[PDB]
């Protein structure tokens, strides 16, 4: 079969009949308000049996790690539950390998375990066998209690370097939120850093006035955190998050980013000062308090807000407006596999009251919803292309800021995706009148160009040109694939160890008042942090550039031989070429960046 | 390890402590009165995975035949139900071979709905019916057409012949019924005219009675114990017939002579003979109904299942795991507890398969079963003893007796293997008496039948006595049960050939043959549930292994492992060729005594 | 395993307990005075069998 535009379609009546059964099975729901959701998981969008196997093993190791921690605490009840978890690992390897089947062990246990891990439920010890003082709980004896949680999952490498200044800056260029630094030519008024602060970090051979003239100053401003969040308590203990401003500078002649100064609050005050690279014990807490903001910021703005919830109305619009015989449907749908499913799990378990975000992260759970919705509301879709953002922020000069993996590796993947969309769109769209007269695309653009309050994407209009459609398909494919990988998998590697970065600060301020362990979360929360961020960051199911189905054959999804034999293999080579160039650069990097390597990038949002 | 007697055991305290925990896992229940039943199924006696898969595939075909029978009536629900049963058939062959959600729950539940006559056995986990075959037959084709996805038995085409009618008395489900008579009983006065109709003018009834050529089958017990019932208001009838059988002079196969449906001669109850046509065919069909009640309750359930149940109970309780006789008898009991419980709470329970199909009220059937257990004599119920008790012994007078000839071989094999096993471990006749565990074992079994014993069990004070009791038990677990359980699939699935109830009045026929047959809704159940009970050959006589996943060898004493049991298995391989040889020359087959086909224990 | 600087070690308290035990094992004696010596030879630093064999062969030729 060859996909076709609706006007040129030889059989329109049977086409518009199919879009009726689509909108009948893809209704709208209010799971998260001011947004466009799907009513549960529609039967087609259910997780594939290959997904459940992959996710199952991770949830099993996470379950086994909780059993190991419960053996260590209170040093048969912890052995029987240890082996039933092992039995599901046996189930997954063989019972699920039936695959044809024509699910029991696979479907039931996996989804149940996933919900129990993201729902922060009290007894994720063993399933089908109907805070606990018998496991790690309360305040810490020493800082060994935080690393010791990783008993059946491996302690991340950041656990042994997170105190280094070089790691603190690497988070801004190769971490979970690597898209927030902005070039400044003059410092803000609420952040009056001094040259004495500067010369403590960049040495005596540089000046703050030189860096502002020569484009070497970079600001990270978590102002939005102060606008939306409300500090909550957990078990009567005060959770604290700040809205800091962090200054960074590259050594003269170009190079890596280097921290300079930190102000924990937005507005200066007697109790709000500027801590610098030499202030020592307070400086380490100022860096840690910045990480606390990043956790709430990444997980709700960068991550869930601007990947999952951003594409959810587009996933809902594509199904409802573009027929299965539409080429754009053929382009976008396999980049949406599991997006409906995982977003429904994130809505009712992750960011629902009593969820992992609610207890761990500092703000009240609803104030976190406002943080996310405010990011989508202020977002500008038609100007959010990766090359476009980089020249808006002033980070695009490869000579001044040389070490910036996300920019260097991501811009490559962006170029590959645009070329393959520019090829796809131009094969089916041969006239700029083919665009305007595509009623399905125009009705697809409508429900997306709606006001954000009515349920649209902020800034989605207009899509009247072959160029404009190429951008929309490049951005969507990027965020579905690379951007989500640039934020989802750093959770396993960089965010699973609470002292390195967590969702709350458990003492009052950077001005250090004593031992570092008092700032860290309680143990029962910190295990949940390690285990739920492990599961979210440890699933690479589906590979960018490999368009297949979610059914048992996992056969090729494209049908047109023009794309099958010519255009898609033209795409997969680009990613293979970029892979070697990225893998080359990543060897010579001390702080690894694997997230733009096309062998690992997923096609869609599924975890 | 070498099993040992309790008095010779180097660690008696650990031994008596295992029996203490044993008697806690095997407690007595009252799942059926008089008898000594077990409380549920103790987890050791749970059905093995191998057993479940074998049964699961049979329960799948039975289900698919019920769907196919529902497609024929009302000539998507039938289509969708067809596939969920196919999914189980694929699930069984693949998932279970990992070596238990699909195996444990689905198999036991499907068996329960077949044996329990539960409605809508069409599909599992997707939760009389006039969208399935029900009611009176349009023609006799409706009965043969019920076997759609199960194979129609061969007796569905031979049963009207008098040759097939007599073969039941020597190679059917109740091959132990006939008895040589010297003079005719007073309530069954058959004439020389009736005899010369069957055998011709060349022979006389007086000549047959002198030369031991007359054999009688007397279903008097059916009259003593049964109460006719009704199904949906339709009269079900059963009789207590006497049938005469003779062999041609000089020896040969059996042949029917006369039939009287009732114990008492009367104007309404007369003697029907070989030439009487439609009336004779009904007098044979009445006997077949009597045999169905008599077989399934006496021959089959009462004297195999229910006979061994108190012995299975006493064996676990009084005999330690380190006891040699315990090592001999437990593998001959695999799943006997599990199937007898599925029998109690489902099969012969009110509302089950026997309650509807068979003519008597279900509680009257129980009395019939208990009547045989009460009159049984264990010590004088050995197969060679019962053969000479009936006068069926002469190999030259009655020459076609497959059960007698094949069975007397398997008996001689088992007795040799038992006599060897016992003589190894019991080296002095003082070892028997001082076997405190075996004497306790004998006590609870020697008890009155009312208290829960086996009738005529005592005394077991000799190595020869223990040898018999172990032979009879092993025989009943293996050969005898094969001779009765599997004829259900081959010889009892077709209702016109034999069934539990008559559905007109009497042999004095008053119309079409199709009216004496059962209603279709029950006739489908009879074929299916007897197909299931006769279509599972799991575990094999002579091959002792475990009921666990490795299925490794069961004995440990290398004396038995590498000598005694191999001696047994060769003898069975030898007798197999003698039986397989004789079976080719036979027109009425008898596979039920072939050593390869026989199971170790009662399990289906 | 990868060595850590002490201010980066993810399990500092355990590291300090090993160092307190190393100070129990290697204690200062004055076998030769004005100098920082050792109380005997601590059992860990006992010479390897490889060394013993190599030295035994040369010591035997001397005898």
TrEMBL record, chain B:
Domain of life: Bacteria
GO process annotations (BP): lipid oxidation
Positions with biased composition (Basic and acidic residues): 10-24
GO molecular function: metal ion binding; oxidoreductase activity, acting on single donors with incorporation of molecular oxygen, incorporation of two atoms of oxygen
Region (Disordered): 1-24, 75-89
Keywords per UniProt: Metal-binding, Oxidoreductase
Keyword Amino-acid biosynthesis applies: no
Record-linked Pfam families: Lipoxygenase
Annotated ranges, domain Lipoxygenase: 128-604
Annotated protein name in UniProt: Arachidonate 15-lipoxygenase
From TrEMBL, chain C:
Biased amino acid composition, Basic and acidic residues: 10-24
Domain of life of the source: Bacteria
Region (Disordered): 1-24
Name this polypeptide is given: Arachidonate 15-lipoxygenase
Organism: Enhygromyxa salina
Residues shown, of full length: 3 to 65 of 650
């Amino acid at each position: 079969n060859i996909p076709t535009l609706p006007q040129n379609d030889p059989r329109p009546e049977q086409r518009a009949q199919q879009l009726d059964k689509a909108r009948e099975t893809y209704k709208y729901a209010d799971l998260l308000p001011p947004l466009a959701f799907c009513e549960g998981v529609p039967k087609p969008d259910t997780p594939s049996a290959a997904w459940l196997v992959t996710v199952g093993k991770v949830a099993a190791a996470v379950a086994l790690n909780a059993v190991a921690n419960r053996r260590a605490w209170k040093r048969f009840d912890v052995g029987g539950t240890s082996e039933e978890d092992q039995n599901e690992a046996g189930h997954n390897s063989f019972l699920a390998r039936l695959e044809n089947f024509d699910e029991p062990s696979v479907l039931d246990e996996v989804n149940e375990r996933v919900a129990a891990i993201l729902g922060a439920k009290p007894n994720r010890h063993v399933p089908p066998a109907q805070v606990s003082k018998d496991g790690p709980n309360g305040r810490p004896q020493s800082m060994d209690d935080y690393a010791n949680l990783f008993r059946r999952i491996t302690l991340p490498p950041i656990a042994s370097t997170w105190k280094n200044d070089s790691a603190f800056a690497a988070y801004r260029v190769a971490g979970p939120n690597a898209s927030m630094i902005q070039r400044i030519t003059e410092l803000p008024d609420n952040f009056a850093v001094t040259d004495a602060h500067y010369k403590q970090a960049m040495g005596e051979g540089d000046s703050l006035d030189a860096a502002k003239a020569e484009g070497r100053l970079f600001l990270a401003d978590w102002k939005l955190i102060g606008e939306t969040l409300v500090n909550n308590t957990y078990k009567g203990a005060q959770k604290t998050v700040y809205a800091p401003l962090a200054l960074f500078a590259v050594p003269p002649g170009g190079g890596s980013l280097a921290p300079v100064a930190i102000q924990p609050g937005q507005t200066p005050s007697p109790t709000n000062k500027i801590y610098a690279t030499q202030d020592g014990n307070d400086w380490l807490a100022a860096k840690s308090a910045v990480q606390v903001a990043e956790g709430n910021y990444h997980e709700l703005v960068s991550h869930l807000g601007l990947t999952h919830l951003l594409l959810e109305p587009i996933v809902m619009a594509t199904y409802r407006q573009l027929a299965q015989h539409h080429p754009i449907y053929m382009l976008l749908i396999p980049h949406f596999e599991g997006t409906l499913s995982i977003n429904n799990s994130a809505a009712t378990n992750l960011i629902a009251p009593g969820g992992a975000v609610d207890l761990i992260f500092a703000g009240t759970i609803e104030s976190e919803h406002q943080l996310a919705l405010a990011a989508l509301k202020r977002h500008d879709f038609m100007r959010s292309g990766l090359p476009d953002t980089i020249e808006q922020r002033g980070v695009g000069d490869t000579s001044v800021l040389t070490d910036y993996p996300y920019r260097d590796d991501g811009l490559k993947i962006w170029a590959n995706i645009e070329r393959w969309v520019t090829a796809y769109v131009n094969n089916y769209y041969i006239s700029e009148a083919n665009v305007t007269q595509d009623t399905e695309l125009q009705a697809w653009a409508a429900v997306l160009s709606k006001p954000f309050a009515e349920g649209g994407v902020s800034g989605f209009g207009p899509i009247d040109t072959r160029a404009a459609l190429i951008f929309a398909c490049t951005k969507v494919i990027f965020t579905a694939s690379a951007e989500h990988s640039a934020v989802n998998f750093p959770q396993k590697d960089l965010m699973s160890y609470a002292p390195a970065i967590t969702g709350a600060g458990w003492t009052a301020a950077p001005p250090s008042q004593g031992p570092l362990k008092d700032f860290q979360p309680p143990l029962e929360l910190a295990e949940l942090q390690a285990e739920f961020l492990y599961l979210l960051g440890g699933v690479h199911h589906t590979k960018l550039g490999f368009y297949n189905s979610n059914s048992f054959p996992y056969r090729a999804w494209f049908k047109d031989p023009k794309i099958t034999a010519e255009l898609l293999p033209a795409f997969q080579r680009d990613l293979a070429a970029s892979e070697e160039l990225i893998v080359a650069a990543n060897a010579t990097r001390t702080f690894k960046y694997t997230y733009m390597i096309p062998s690992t990038i997923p096609m869609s949002i599924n975890i």
